[PDB]
Amino acid sequence: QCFYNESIAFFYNRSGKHLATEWNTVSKLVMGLGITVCIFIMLANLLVMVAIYVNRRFHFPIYYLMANLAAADFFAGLAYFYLMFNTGPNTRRLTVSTWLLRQGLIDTSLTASVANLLAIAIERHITVFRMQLHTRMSNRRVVVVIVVIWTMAIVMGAIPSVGWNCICDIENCSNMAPLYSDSYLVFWAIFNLVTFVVMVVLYAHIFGYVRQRTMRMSRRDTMMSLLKTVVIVLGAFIICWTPGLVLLLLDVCCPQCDVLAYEKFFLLLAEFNSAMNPIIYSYRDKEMSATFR
Amino acid sequence: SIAQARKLVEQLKMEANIDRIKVSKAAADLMAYCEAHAKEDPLLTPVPASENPFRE
Amino acid sequence: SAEDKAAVERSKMIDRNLREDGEKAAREVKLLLLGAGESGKSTIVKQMKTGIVETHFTFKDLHFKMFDVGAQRSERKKWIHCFEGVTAIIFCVALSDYDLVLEMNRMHESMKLFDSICNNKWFTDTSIILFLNKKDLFEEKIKKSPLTICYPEYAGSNTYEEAAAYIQCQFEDLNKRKDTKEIYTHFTCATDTKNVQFVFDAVTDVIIKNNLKDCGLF
Amino acid sequence: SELDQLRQEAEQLKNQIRDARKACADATLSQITNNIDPVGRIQMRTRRTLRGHLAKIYAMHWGTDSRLLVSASQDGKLIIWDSYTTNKVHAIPLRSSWVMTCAYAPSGNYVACGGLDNICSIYNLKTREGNVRVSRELAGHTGYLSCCRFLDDNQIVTSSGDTTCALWDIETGQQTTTFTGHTGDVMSLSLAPDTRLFVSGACDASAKLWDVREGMCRQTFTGHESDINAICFFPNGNAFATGSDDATCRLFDLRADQELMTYSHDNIICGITSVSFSKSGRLLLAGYDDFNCNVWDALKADRAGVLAGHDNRVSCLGVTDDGMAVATGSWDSFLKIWN
Numbered sequence: 001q002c003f004y005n006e007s008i009a010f011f012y013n014r015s016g017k018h019l020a021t022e023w024n025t026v027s028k029l030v031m032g033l034g035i036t037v038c039i040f041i042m043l044a045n046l047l048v049m050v051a052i053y054v055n056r057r058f059h060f061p062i063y064y065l066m067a068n069l070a071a072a073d074f075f076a077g078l079a080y081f082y083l084m085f086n087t088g089p090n091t092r093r094l095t096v097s098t099w100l101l102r103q104g105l106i107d108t109s110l111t112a113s114v115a116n117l118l119a120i121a122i123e124r125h126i127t128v129f130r131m132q133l134h135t136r137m138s139n140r141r142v143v144v145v146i147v148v149i150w151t152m153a154i155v156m157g158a159i160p161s162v163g164w165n166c167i168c169d170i171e172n173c174s175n176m177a178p179l180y181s182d183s184y185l186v187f188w189a190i191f192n193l194v195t196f197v198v199m200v201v202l203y204a205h206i207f208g209y210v211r212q213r214t215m216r217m218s219r220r221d222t223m224m225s226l227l228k229t230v231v232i233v234l235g236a237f238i239i240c241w242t243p244g245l246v247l248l249l250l251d252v253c254c255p256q257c258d259v260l261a262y263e264k265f266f267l268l269l270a271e272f273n274s275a276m277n278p279i280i281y282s283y284r285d286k287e288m289s290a291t292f293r
Numbered sequence: 294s295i296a297q298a299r300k301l302v303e304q305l306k307m308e309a310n311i312d313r314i315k316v317s318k319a320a321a322d323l324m325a326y327c328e329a330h331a332k333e334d335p336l337l338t339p340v341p342a343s344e345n346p347f348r349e
Numbered sequence: 350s351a352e353d354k355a356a357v358e359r360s361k362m363i364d365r366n367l368r369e370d371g372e373k374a375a376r377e378v379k380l381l382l383l384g385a386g387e388s389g390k391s392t393i394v395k396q397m398k399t400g401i402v403e404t405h406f407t408f409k410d411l412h413f414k415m416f417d418v419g420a421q422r423s424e425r426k427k428w429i430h431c432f433e434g435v436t437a438i439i440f441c442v443a444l445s446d447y448d449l450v451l452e453m454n455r456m457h458e459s460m461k462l463f464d465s466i467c468n469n470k471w472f473t474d475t476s477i478i479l480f481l482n483k484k485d486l487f488e489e490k491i492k493k494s495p496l497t498i499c500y501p502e503y504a505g506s507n508t509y510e511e512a513a514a515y516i517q518c519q520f521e522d523l524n525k526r527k528d529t530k531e532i533y534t535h536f537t538c539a540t541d542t543k544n545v546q547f548v549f550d551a552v553t554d555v556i557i558k559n560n561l562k563d564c565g566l567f
Numbered sequence: 568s569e570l571d572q573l574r575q576e577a578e579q580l581k582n583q584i585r586d587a588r589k590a591c592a593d594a595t596l597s598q599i600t601n602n603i604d605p606v607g608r609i610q611m612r613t614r615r616t617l618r619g620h621l622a623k624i625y626a627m628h629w630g631t632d633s634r635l636l637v638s639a640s641q642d643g644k645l646i647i648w649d650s651y652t653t654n655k656v657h658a659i660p661l662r663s664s665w666v667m668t669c670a671y672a673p674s675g676n677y678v679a680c681g682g683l684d685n686i687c688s689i690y691n692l693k694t695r696e697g698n699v700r701v702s703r704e705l706a707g708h709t710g711y712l713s714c715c716r717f718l719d720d721n722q723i724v725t726s727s728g729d730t731t732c733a734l735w736d737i738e739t740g741q742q743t744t745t746f747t748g749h750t751g752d753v754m755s756l757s758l759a760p761d762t763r764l765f766v767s768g769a770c771d772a773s774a775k776l777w778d779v780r781e782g783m784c785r786q787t788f789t790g791h792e793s794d795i796n797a798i799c800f801f802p803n804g805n806a807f808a809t810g811s812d813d814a815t816c817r818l819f820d821l822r823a824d825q826e827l828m829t830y831s832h833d834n835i836i837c838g839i840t841s842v843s844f845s846k847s848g849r850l851l852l853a854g855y856d857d858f859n860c861n862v863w864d865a866l867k868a869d870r871a872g873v874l875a876g877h878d879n880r881v882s883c884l885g886v887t888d889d890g891m892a893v894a895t896g897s898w899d900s901f902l903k904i905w906n
């Protein structure tokens with residue numbers, strides 16, 4: 001019934017997206033910005049990974065999760081680099097399978113990054129709320145959560161690649177992803193919002209518990225540092241994802257909305273999220289900065 | 294601390310009257326004993342892992 | 350292999366018993382009790398509850414162990430490292446000895462011991478709970494003799510409120526790892542029987558801060 | 568007046584002993600050993616690692632069977648392994664979790680431990696009807712127990728930080744003999760093959776040779792500039808070696824009565840924890856605080872191997888009576904066997 005034999009031109013014409021026939025000024029601008037952001041992401045995350053693997057001190061679950069996040073950010077940078085040199089005029093020569101792969105790469109990379117953030121939050125909550133003195137973990141749960149993260153990311157990336165595509169639901173197709181369906185966009189946005197809510201709740205509970213159990217001995221304030229760290233961690237995610245996340249909602253709910261205007265800058269910001277992640281989770285640790293040299 | 298001093302002198306007294314031997318003779322005897330038992334030292338001559346009880 | 354598997358079974362039983370013992374032990378606090386020759390450490394032991402004495406107790410569903418090694422009378426540089434990893438070091442000092450002598454003042458010897466302990470290369474990240482005993486005795490004594498005998502640089506009224514704070518700041522200043530560790534001071538109250546509550550609060554704060562430090566929160 | 572003249576006579580006697588030692592020093596072992604060829608690089612690999620301890624390891628000891636060995640840890644357990652099959656045979660729970668020494672009887676019937684409690688606990692492994700129970704608890708020392716070696720099934724030599732050593736009697740429980748003369752904490756001791764003599768090293772930068780039968784000091788050796796943490800006998804019985812915190816080992820000879828050889832490397836500055844000799848005496852293994860153990864050459868005084876597989880300080884090191892392997896235990900809670 002549905003059209004697997006058609007070309008990308010038909011899918012892009014059914015929507016309002018346009019195909020560029022040459023390198024426009026905006027095309028070169030976004031290409032340069034993306035190349036710079038990609039090289040920065042790769043360099044920073046490779047440095048983080050090598051620093052974590054080299055030193056013997058960084059052999060604990062939190063550092064393992066940080067290294068997994070760094071690897072996910074490196075993968076996101078590679079995916080965004082591949083996206084570049086395949087956008088603009090190059091996208092006019094892409095086929096269905098290649099387009100699906102190019103988008104699934106970004107999808108799974110960003111999903112893995114978000115899941116790593118959530119896992120870091122959960123591990124911090126566990127480590128803080130373990131009223132028991134040490135109760136050292138067997139160190140096997142970290143690998144379990146890592147493999148679960150990667151499996152969930154691979155699933156979220158491959159589902160739209162095989163089966164959950166608007167190829168056979170042509171009328172119910174998006175505008176920024178003419179091949180994908182709006183249902184997948186809604187699902188991804190709900191997942192992102194739920195992860196953010198869970199992170200905020202966990203960090204707020206941590207802050208409240210710490211304040212309650214430290215006020216007695218209060219009288220380098222711990223409250224100020226903890227609040228600053230939580231606020232930064234949450235505000236990065238907010239400023240990076242909210243403007244891009246609301247765009248999918250505008251596309252699915254508001255027809256005639258000029259969603260195609262700021263999609264590229266919003267994706268650049270979502271990638272800047274991973275570019276800035278290694279700094280947020282690695283600047284406070286003085287030993288981490290000391291190991292750098 | 295006179296008692297301590299007398300005890301220390303009495304102790305040092307017996308140290309001097311010992312059958313001391315020249316360093317050359319002691320070194321020669323040490324080298325002789327060390328090279329005579331060299332065949333029986335596994336650490337010295339690595340033994341094949343087949344016979345070593347700990348290797349395999 | 351008629352019995353070789355019984356050896357493996359016994360090894361597994363021993364291993365699970367060791368795991369259970371480790372689990373039971375990991376939920377016990379370690380407080381190394383230190384002090385000079387003469388202080389109220391015995392009074393502290395009595396209030397809370399040949400070579401080494403171990404006192405175990407429990408407060409608000411939290412267990413505590415306290416070790417006293419004042420009867421060693423040997424070179425401290427050799428066995429001190431054995432106490433690396435303890436949750437805290439409860440140091441004791443009697444204020445009344447500010448004017449007494451050992452030859453030399455006892456307070457100066459206590460300060461030397463505190464400097465040697467706090468700045469040791471094994472106790473860099475271990476916090477110290479300082480106790481200043483003989484509160485009423487010092488309050489009654491200071492009226493006769495001034496604190497200038499021990500600390501000549503002191504410039505203040507011969508009153509308990511001021512002299513006690515002066516001694517507290519002098520003892521806290523000796524700390525050099527001002528960022529890795531924290532010092533908790535509390536003047537022992539005999540009537541209140543609140544010395545266990547302060548220890549509990551301090552240990553809770555220390556545990557929470559160490560937990561935060563384990564992760565990137567602090 | 569008497570104290571002054573006694574001190575002067577003591578100093579004159581020390582000078583006379585120095586002159587006698589110099590006269591006996593006709594040459595140096597380095598020159599006599601220059602002709603013989605080097606042994607070559609000695610490479611050893613970790614053949615088996617043992618797990619089970621949840622805290623630092625402070626001491627271990629091999630048995631005469633060359634199969635079972637005892638190890639202690641701060642966690643309060645005393646474990647008996649099986650190097651051939653890394654099978655835990657016994658795990659005795661200690662009354663005090665502060666232990667700094669171990670020992671395995673020559674007959675394999677008893678073991679010993681001790682430390683800050685100042686009590687030497689002797690455990691019997693018979694287990695006629697139930698779990699291993701404390702056979703005896705020797706008390707009387709006024710300091711921490713640093714080392715203890717089973718002289719026999721009824722006798723045992725102990726050393727403490729009270730600047731003295733003791734020879735006990737398990738059946739009686741009283742100090743059969745006492746050895747005094749040291750000025751600092753005795754950190755280690757080593758028994759001779761015949762059990763007729765032993766040597767003790769203290770923090771006074773000196774070592775002393777004691778006769779068990781008589782009870783006096785035979786010789787006193789000096790030359791170090793710091794505390795002696797370990798001491799081992801030469802298989803022959805006429806020499807020994809001492810390791811100190813000054814990053815230097817020294818091999819002394821009894822009959823020569825002076826410093827025979829010195830082992831020091833500019834690249835090494837950390838302290839030394841344990842020393843041992845091979846079955847032939849060629850190799851002088853020494854564990855350091857740098858997390859490694861450096862093999863030496865008793866005759867040539869040149870490094871011939873480095874063992875580095877521990878993540879923390881190497882606390883204890885031992886060589887089997889057969890010489891087929893070497894055991895090492897560190898503060899990382901893991902034991903390892905080499906060769």
Ligand SMILES: CCCCCCCC/C=C/CCCCCCCC(=O)OC[C@@H](O)COP(=O)(O)O
Nearest residue numbers: 087088091107110176177188244263266267270
């Ligand atoms: C608009 C960005 C909002 C943030 C979304 C981060 C992506 C996470 C995955 C979401 C699943 C649905 C994403 C659908 C929008 C993806 C748009 C995109 O990433 O393509 C870039 C676009 O220029 C391509 O232009 P051409 O090369 O000229 O076709």
